[PDB]
Amino acid sequence: VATNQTGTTVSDSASGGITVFADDSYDYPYVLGHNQDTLPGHLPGENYVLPQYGYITRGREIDQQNSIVAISDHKTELFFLEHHDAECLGTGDHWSHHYEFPDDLPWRKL
Amino acid sequence: LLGGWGVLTPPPMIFVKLRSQPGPPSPGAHTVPQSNLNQYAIFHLHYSMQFLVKRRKRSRRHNPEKPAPFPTTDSGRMPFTLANSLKDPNTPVYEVPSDQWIARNYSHLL
């Protein structure tokens, strides 16, 4: 996206890339499955803009006054996903991740 | 609720007793058995226990993680050590922490 006084002109970047990886080790806060609205729209043709990733962490939570604040002198975690093995992708690259649920799952009656 | 591991078949209770040595037998005269010879046994008790353990898989995080608090003694001296004198010269006072040491040391994502 090149912003100009002329206007915004989008143009392919042959040099761009994306960096994708999956947690098979569950080593980052697992944010899926809390029913937060990030999903593909029901309509194909409704573009799906991927949700940003964030995670809650707790400190020491003290009641100082009517308002409670977390001073964060403990139990505060900082996850740089930058530091982890990921796969640089670019125009013309295919990345797929296959996954299989446990066999132990119960049959949910319909 | 109160402790480590409930077990169906626990470590057997190991029952020990002095082999009783009775006193001189009376010629069926006063019909009161002499008390057993007073005696006591002293012995080494070897007790070894093996624990299965797993090395910690550290949460992959960028923060140094504050360790579990090191024990504190009411006395202020180092815990689990022999202190020379507490208002005596006679015997050293072994010092245990003010509060129970808890085996919980480092966070892990739940």
TrEMBL record, chain A:
Top-level taxon in the UniProt lineage: Viruses
This protein's name: ORF2
Stretch forming the signal peptide: none
Cellular compartments annotated: Virion
Family affiliation: Belongs to the parvoviridae capsid protein family.
Span covered, complete protein: 474 to 583 of 914
